Each structure stands twice: as C-alpha cells, then as structure tokens.
Enzyme design. Structure first.
Site, PDB file in Angstrom:
ATOM      1  N   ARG A 182       0.855  -1.180   0.000  1.00  0.00           N
ATOM      2  CA  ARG A 182       0.000   0.000   0.000  1.00  0.00           C
ATOM      3  C   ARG A 182       0.917   1.265   0.000  1.00  0.00           C
ATOM      4  O   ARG A 182       1.852   1.404   0.792  1.00  0.00           O
ATOM      5  CB  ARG A 182      -0.917  -0.056   1.200  1.00  0.00           C
TER       6      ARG A 182
ATOM      7  N   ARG B  19      -0.502  -5.514   4.466  1.00  0.00           N
ATOM      8  CA  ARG B  19       0.110  -4.827   3.348  1.00  0.00           C
ATOM      9  C   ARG B  19       1.373  -4.118   3.729  1.00  0.00           C
ATOM     10  O   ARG B  19       1.478  -3.500   4.808  1.00  0.00           O
ATOM     11  CB  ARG B  19      -0.899  -3.833   2.685  1.00  0.00           C
TER      12      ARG B  19
ATOM     13  N   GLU C 275     -11.203   4.536  -5.327  1.00  0.00           N
ATOM     14  CA  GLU C 275     -11.412   3.119  -5.598  1.00  0.00           C
ATOM     15  C   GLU C 275     -11.869   3.007  -7.071  1.00  0.00           C
ATOM     16  O   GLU C 275     -12.398   3.956  -7.621  1.00  0.00           O
ATOM     17  CB  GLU C 275     -12.483   2.514  -4.662  1.00  0.00           C
TER      18      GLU C 275
ATOM     19  N   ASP D 285      -3.952   8.606  -1.293  1.00  0.00           N
ATOM     20  CA  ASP D 285      -5.235   7.927  -1.440  1.00  0.00           C
ATOM     21  C   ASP D 285      -5.674   8.129  -2.851  1.00  0.00           C
ATOM     22  O   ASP D 285      -5.991   9.246  -3.239  1.00  0.00           O
ATOM     23  CB  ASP D 285      -6.275   8.446  -0.479  1.00  0.00           C
ATOM     24  N   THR D 286      -5.721   7.042  -3.603  1.00  0.00           N
ATOM     25  CA  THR D 286      -6.451   7.024  -4.864  1.00  0.00           C
ATOM     26  C   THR D 286      -7.950   6.721  -4.701  1.00  0.00           C
ATOM     27  O   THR D 286      -8.377   6.048  -3.776  1.00  0.00           O
ATOM     28  CB  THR D 286      -5.790   6.041  -5.868  1.00  0.00           C
TER      29      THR D 286
HETATM   30  C1  LIG Z   1      -1.815   4.322   3.792  1.00  0.00           C
HETATM   31  C2  LIG Z   1      -2.131   3.589   5.070  1.00  0.00           C
HETATM   32  C3  LIG Z   1      -3.373   2.965   5.250  1.00  0.00           C
HETATM   33  N1  LIG Z   1      -3.647   2.313   6.388  1.00  0.00           N
HETATM   34  C4  LIG Z   1      -4.970   1.710   6.649  1.00  0.00           C
HETATM   35  C5  LIG Z   1      -5.846   2.820   7.236  1.00  0.00           C
HETATM   36  C6  LIG Z   1      -7.207   2.522   6.696  1.00  0.00           C
HETATM   37  O1  LIG Z   1      -7.913   1.627   7.591  1.00  0.00           O
HETATM   38  P1  LIG Z   1      -9.450   1.261   7.266  1.00  0.00           P
HETATM   39  O2  LIG Z   1      -9.467   0.139   6.254  1.00  0.00           O
HETATM   40  O3  LIG Z   1      -9.878   0.857   8.642  1.00  0.00           O
HETATM   41  O4  LIG Z   1     -10.132   2.473   6.710  1.00  0.00           O
HETATM   42  C7  LIG Z   1      -6.949   1.786   5.390  1.00  0.00           C
HETATM   43  C8  LIG Z   1      -7.011   2.659   4.155  1.00  0.00           C
HETATM   44  O5  LIG Z   1      -6.454   1.900   3.077  1.00  0.00           O
HETATM   45  P2  LIG Z   1      -7.177   1.949   1.612  1.00  0.00           P
HETATM   46  O6  LIG Z   1      -7.209   3.370   1.116  1.00  0.00           O
HETATM   47  O7  LIG Z   1      -6.340   1.000   0.786  1.00  0.00           O
HETATM   48  O8  LIG Z   1      -8.543   1.412   1.881  1.00  0.00           O
HETATM   49  O9  LIG Z   1      -5.643   1.300   5.443  1.00  0.00           O
HETATM   50  C9  LIG Z   1      -2.675   2.301   7.424  1.00  0.00           C
HETATM   51  O10 LIG Z   1      -2.935   1.702   8.504  1.00  0.00           O
HETATM   52  N2  LIG Z   1      -1.480   2.843   7.270  1.00  0.00           N
HETATM   53  C10 LIG Z   1      -1.142   3.538   6.170  1.00  0.00           C
HETATM   54  O11 LIG Z   1      -0.016   4.096   6.099  1.00  0.00           O
HETATM   55 CA   LIG Z   2      -7.755   3.950  -1.824  1.00  0.00          CA
END
Ligand SMILES: Cc1cn([C@H]2C[C@H](OP(=O)(O)O)[C@@H](COP(=O)(O)O)O2)c(=O)[nH]c1=O
Ligand SMILES: [Ca+2]
EC number: 3.1.31.1
Length: 129
Positions: free
Chosen positions: A29, A75, A37, A34-35
């Site tokens: 990730r 991830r 979806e 944030d892209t």
């Molecule tokens: C980018 C990033 C996302 N995340 C987690 C937070 C968000 O939790 P939630 O799933 O509970 O919202 C989720 C967002 O990722 P996505 O944008 O891939 O969904 O991934 C982290 O924990 N650390 C990070 O550095």
């Molecule tokens: Ca996203």
C-alpha cells in the site's frame, strides 16, 4: 531512507500493487496517498496510471519509511519507485491521488507530496478539475 529491490508481480489498483520483495510475494500500500477506488471517479484513470508506471518500469524499488512497515491488513507500507521516479509522488502530481493517511513516524516524504498536490491543484488536474 533507502531503496531496496523488488519485481512486479501484478498491478492491482491506484495505490496498491503486488511485488516480489526479498523473494516473497507481498501486497504493497503506497504511503501518504489515497487514490479513488476503481468504482469511483478517476479510479480507473488512477489504476491505469499506476499499472502503466509499474509495467513500463525496468527497475522497481521499495523504500520503507522509519515506522511500521506493514499495515493491519498485512500490506507493506512503502514509497515505490519506477526507474527512480516515485509512484506515490507521480500520482499526486497528476491529481490522481490526494495526500492522505499521514501518520507520525512514517511521513518522511509528506512535504514533497504536498508540494506536488499544490501544483496539481493549481493546474486543476483530474481530481482537482
Ligand atoms: C496508507 C495507510 C493505510 N492504512 C490503513 C488505514 C485505513 O484503515 P481502514 O481500512 O480501517 O479504513 C486503510 C485505508 O487503506 P485503503 O485506502 O487502501 O482502503 O488502510 C494504514 O494503517 N497505514 C497507512 O499508512
Ligand atoms: Ca484507496
């Protein structure tokens, strides 16, 4: 921070990929972005952009920050570079991602990406159009 090797296994979407790292398949990730979806607006353009940047790359590298290297979903959290060019920054600079998810301790490239976001916004690009 330092760059480490990896090889593409598969594009996934705007801000996730599947790479081979230290010989193991992992989903990454992208830090600090944030892209949309795939089903959202600019989601397909974001996926394509990331896919192309990954697939045209001769050399993929992973750069972890100072903090957690894996998130709660397993991830990997990294800056990813395609032929020396950061994918995370490139997405922002094109307005296909927002600066997001800036957690204390994994935020080394925050100000670099914010500068890119300001430029994309000035240019009214994509998400900022
Ligand atoms: C980018 C990033 C996302 N995340 C987690 C937070 C968000 O939790 P939630 O799933 O509970 O919202 C989720 C967002 O990722 P996505 O944008 O891939 O969904 O991934 C982290 O924990 N650390 C990070 O550095
Ligand atoms: Ca996203």
């Amino acid at each position: 921070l330092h760059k480490e090797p990896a090889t593409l296994i598969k594009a996934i979407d705007g801000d996730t990929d599947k790479l081979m790292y230290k010989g193991q398949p992992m989903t990454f990730r992208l830090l600090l972005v944030d892209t949309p979806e795939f089903n959202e607006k600019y989601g397909p353009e974001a996926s394509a952009f990331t896919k192309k940047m990954h697939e045209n790359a001769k050399k993929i590298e992973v750069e972890f920050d100072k903090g957690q290297r894996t998130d709660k979903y397993g991830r990997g959290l990294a800056y990813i570079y395609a032929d020396g060019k950061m994918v995370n920054e490139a997405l922002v600079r094109q307005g296909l991602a927002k600066v997001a998810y800036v957690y204390k301790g994994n935020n080394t490239h925050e100000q670099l990406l914010r500068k890119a976001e300001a430029q994309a916004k000035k240019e009214k690009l994509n998400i900022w159009s």
